[PDB]
Design a protein around this nucleic acid. Structure first.
Ligand SMILES: [Ca+2]
Ligand SMILES: [K+]
Length: 345
DNA sequence: CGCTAGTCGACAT
DNA sequence: TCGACTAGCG
C-alpha cells in the first residue's frame, strides 16, 4: 500500500452500495477480510490455539455478496516477490518481537495491555487462507491464488474485463492500473468506490494526468518496493513530476533537488531501486484464468529484457502455475493440499 | 500554513 | 499490517 494515498485522492470517490453490481463479477482482496477477521481472535491465533473465527468473518461478507446476486472472486497472495522480500523482512521481525512481548511479558497476571500487541503481531498464513478457500468453494464461490501479489492479479482481472470492480482497503491498486476499487465496504454492502475515470480530474501532476505519472508519484512517495528519500511524500512527488520537462525518469530522479528547491543526493542504488520498483508495477507476473498461463501484468513493450526481470516474479511451467492458482498446491513445498477440478459441469 | 512522518485502533462486546 | 489523526519541522 501507498501511505496517505487515499486522503490524497479522496475527491475521486463516490459513496456507493455494492448492490449496483448485481449480475456482475467482483474480485475481492481477501487478505483484508482475513486480517480483520484475525483481529477478533488475536489471542487464540497468537498462542497457536485452534480457531475458525476468521473463516466465519470472511464468509459473512461472502454471503452478503451472494444475497445481492453478486458473483465474487476471492483472490489470494501467492509467492513472496523478491522486490518485497526486503520489506517483508522488516515486517517478519516486527510480528516476531511484537508477539513475544505480549506473549509472556503480559501473560502473567493482567492481560489488557498484551492484546494490543497480539493484534499487531497477526500473521496471515497460507493455512488460514486455505480454510477460507475451502469454505468458499463449498458454496460455489470462485477462488484464485495469485502467482505472487494479489494486487497485480486483482488489477489484471479488472483490466481484462473478467471482473467489474475490486473490493479492497488498498488504494494503491490504482497504481497497478486497475479500473474500479471499492474501499471501506462494510458487512452490509456500503462501500466507497473510486473510479480511475474520475482520477484524471487531477492537475497536481501537471496539465496532463497520466497513469505513468501517477505510478511514478506512488513510487517516489514510497512503497513496498522502494522507500522514499528523506522528506519526500506524495505532494513533493507531484511537484517533481509536475515541474520536470524531460521524458526519461532517471534523468529527473537526480534532478529532484533542482525541482524541489531542496538539497538532497540520490544514491546510485536508489536509481536502480526506482527502475526495479517501476518494472515490478508494470510487469509483475500474474495468472491468466482464461488461457491458464503465466503472463506479466502488462505486455512487455518495445524495449525490455524479461531475463533481467527476475525481481518481478520468476517464471514457472504453466502447469505448476495452474495448480497453485487453483489452490491445489502448497506455495513453498508444492505438496498436494487439494484436488479442485475447474473443468467439471 | 503545507507537508512528512510518526502513534493508535481495527473486532467484539 | 492498513487508514485516520496529530505532532512538528520547512
Ligand atoms: Ca497487497
Ligand atoms: K514518504
Amino acid at each position: 500500500g501507498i501511505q496517505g494515498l487515499l486522503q490524497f485522492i479522496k475527491e475521486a470517490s463516490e459513496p456507493i452500495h455494492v448492490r449496483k453490481y448485481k449480475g456482475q463479477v467482483v474480485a475481492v482482496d481477501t487478505y483484508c477480510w482475513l486480517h480483520k477477521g484475525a483481529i477478533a481472535c488475536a489471542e487464540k491465533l497468537a498462542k497457536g490455539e485452534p480457531t475458525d473465527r476468521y473463516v466465519g468473518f470472511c464468509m459473512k461478507f461472502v454471503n452478503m455478496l451472494l444475497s445481492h446476486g453478486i458473483k465474487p472472486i476471492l483472490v489470494f497472495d501467492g509467492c513472496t516477490l523478491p522486490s518485497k522480500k526486503e520489506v517483508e523482512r522488516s515486517r517478519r521481525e516486527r510480528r516476531q518481537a511484537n508477539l513475544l512481548k505480549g506473549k509472556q511479558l503480559l501473560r502473567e497476571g493482567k492481560v489488557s495491555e498484551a492484546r494490543e500487541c497480539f493484534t499487531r503481531s497477526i500473521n496471515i498464513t497460507h493455512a488460514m487462507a486455505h480454510k477460507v478457500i475451502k469454505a468458499a468453494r463449498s458454496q460455489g464461490v470462485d477462488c484464485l491464488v495469485a502467482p505472487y501479489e494479489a494486487d497485480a492479479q486483482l488489477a489484471y482481472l479488472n483490466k481484462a474485463g473478467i471482473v467489474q470492480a475490486i473490493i479492497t482497503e488498498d488504494s494503491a491498486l490504482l497504481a497497478f492500473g486497475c479500473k474500479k476499487v471499492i474501499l471501506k465496504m462494510d458487512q452490509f454492502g456500503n462501500g466507497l468506490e473510486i473510479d480511475q475515470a474520475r482520477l484524471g480530474m487531477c492537475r497536481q501532476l501537471g496539465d496532463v494526468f497520466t497513469e505513468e505519472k501517477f505510478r511514478y508519484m506512488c513510487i517516489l512517495s514510497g512503497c513496498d518496493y522502494l522507500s522514499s528519500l528523506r522528506g519526500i511524500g506524495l505532494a513533493k512527488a507531484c511537484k517533481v513530476l509536475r515541474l520536470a520537462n524531460n521524458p526519461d525518469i532517471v534523468k529527473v530522479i537526480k534532478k529532484i533537488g533542482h525541482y524541489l528547491k531542496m538539497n538532497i543526493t540520490v544514491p546510485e542504488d536508489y536509481i536502480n531501486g526506482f527502475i526495479r520498483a517501476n518494472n515490478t508495477f508494470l510487469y509483475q507476473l500474474v495468472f491468466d484464468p482464461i488461457k491458464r498461463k503465466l503472463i506479466p501484468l502488462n505486455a512487455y513493450e518495445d524495449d525490455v529484457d524479461p531475463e533481467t526481470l527476475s525481481y518481478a516474479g520468476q517464471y514457472v511451467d504453466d502447469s505448476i502455475a495452474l495448480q497453485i492458482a487453483l489452490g491445489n498446491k502448497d506455495i513453498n513445498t508444492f505438496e498436494q493440499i487439494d484436488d479442485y477440478n475447474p473443468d467439471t459441469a
